[PDB]
């Protein structure tokens, strides 16, 4: 269950959603699955919202067990999109839909691709086939106001603010990744090694991080460990049951230390009330000698092709 706002019980599918400037205003909008909704509006001929009553906490995730969504405060690729940290791309005809996930009835599903993040949307009164390749009409969606089970998030992903690295570091990580995965030739169509003869696209369960360069760093053996920062992004402001504080109220509550909050908030910021968001903190990869605070980190399924020797 959520971080700010309980699941939304929306009035009409034809109402539009405002662009808010507050941090907690957006964190709430993410709780009410408003962001996935806008995406579908902006992109797929969708009418209305998604996440009815259930909200963001009630979305379906590909691996049936899914550790990171158990912590309400880890950001998904869509949640990280809604705060500008990345872009969930519109699917291209070429973008490969991994098999495994239960696409039947889904109006939006998303997965990380090797060079970015790709999500899939459906139009009015439609939902995804069981293959994922087609939206056949589902009259159980014609209300336009769909529950959170119509939203699918593939992979066990976390997204966090990233201290960005010199490309020199990235080339050196990129190289090591090829050395642990010598056999893979192309991932999601992006050249990973250079190959003569390449196999058929196969399914691929993999660890990776987004370090913010040309593509992710897939890792076989590595070490992850979490540290809590108590930062300004780690605290949310609200009036209980009335929603989140406005942008002005928020900027003030955190800088003039004159609002309320929990012990962890007061310990660092002094004392609308703002408290610590439930997450283990921020993850720090340790891979092939180096330490990196990545943008996103996760265990997804992508489409890799292999070497024919």
């Amino acid at each position, epitope marked *: 269950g959520p971080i700010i706002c309980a699941g939304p019980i929306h009035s009409n599918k034809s109402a539009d959603i405002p662009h808010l400037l507050g941090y907690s205003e957006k964190i709430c909008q993410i709780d009410r699955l408003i962001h996935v909704s806008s995406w579908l509006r902006n992109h797929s001929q969708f009418q209305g919202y998604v996440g009815q009553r259930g909200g963001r906490s009630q979305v379906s995730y590909y691996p049936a067990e899914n550790s990171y969504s158990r912590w309400s405060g880890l950001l998904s690729p869509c949640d990280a999109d809604w705060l500008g940290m990345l872009v969930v791309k519109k699917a291209k005809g070429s973008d490969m839909i991994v098999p495994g996930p239960s696409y039947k009835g889904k109006v939006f599903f998303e997965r990380p691709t090797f060079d970015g993040y790709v999500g899939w949307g459906c139009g009015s009164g439609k939902s995804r086939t069981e293959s994922g390749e087609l939206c056949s009409s589902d009259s159980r969606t014609s209300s336009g106001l769909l529950p959170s089970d119509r939203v699918l998030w593939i992979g066990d992903v976390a997204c966090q603010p990233m201290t*960005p690295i*010199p*490309e*020199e*570091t990235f*080339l050196e990580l990129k*190289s090591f990744s090829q050395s642990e995965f010598p056999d893979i030739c192309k991932i999601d169509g992006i050249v990973f090694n250079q190959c003569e003869g390449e196999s058929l696209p196969q399914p691929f369960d993999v660890a990776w991080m987004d370090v913010g360069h040309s593509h992710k760093i897939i890792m076989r053996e590595h070490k992850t460990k979490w540290v809590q920062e108590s930062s300004s992004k780690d605290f949310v402001c609200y009036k209980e049951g009335t929603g989140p504080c406005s942008e002005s109220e928020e900027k003030t509550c955190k800088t003039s230390g004159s609002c309320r909050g929990d012990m962890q908030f007061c310990k660092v910021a002094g004392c609308c009330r703002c408290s610590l968001v439930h997450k283990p903190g921020e993850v720090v990869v340790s891979y092939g000698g*180096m*330490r990196v605070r990545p943008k996103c980190y996760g265990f997804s399924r992508m489409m890799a092709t292999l070497e024919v020797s």
Partner: antibody
Amino acid sequence: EVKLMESGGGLVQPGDSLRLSCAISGFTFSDYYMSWVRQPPGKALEWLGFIRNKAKGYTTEYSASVKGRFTISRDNSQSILYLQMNTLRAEDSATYYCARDYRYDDEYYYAMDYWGQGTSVTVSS
Amino acid sequence: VVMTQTTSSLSASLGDRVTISCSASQGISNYLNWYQQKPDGTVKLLIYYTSILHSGVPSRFSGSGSGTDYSLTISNLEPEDIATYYCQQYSKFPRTFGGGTKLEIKR
């Protein structure tokens, strides 16, 4: 006392090749990456490429400006860094420095902390 | 990435504080170094990672900055400090240097 001394520049004709070299004093050569940097006359320092250390197994990287014509290489036995300049061209003429760079991966502190004196190359017809 | 040193030359008087300013075509997330070249041609490292002083550099030197804007500051121009000052970034692949800033004395 970390010392670098470039050598081998001169006046060569376009198309010619010419090899520059950089001699090392005062520090364990195989430990450090090394970069070649050139400074066209009446211009600013251009960075050209580098050769990693023994730890990262003597890999190289090259700026787009000269990829496929130049070649950095080291000779751990003699403590010498070489820049190999093939298919030279009028734009290549400049003075060429080599410099050892300091790397602190844990913090991403990468900087060229000791420099040669420069060797001058002029490519002209 | 394209670095710009705002002023090609920069006049000053011995003893007072001087500031050379470096501006980047895009945010370089503090991966910025400062070198000083003297007329003999010699080059030395001064500051790496925006503010960290290279070994054996005097304390009157300091640099600072963020995002796309960075600056080097000598607190007492001393005659040896008369030299061209080059900044250089390492967030993106082709390490790129500024255009320099040569220091002239006011009379």
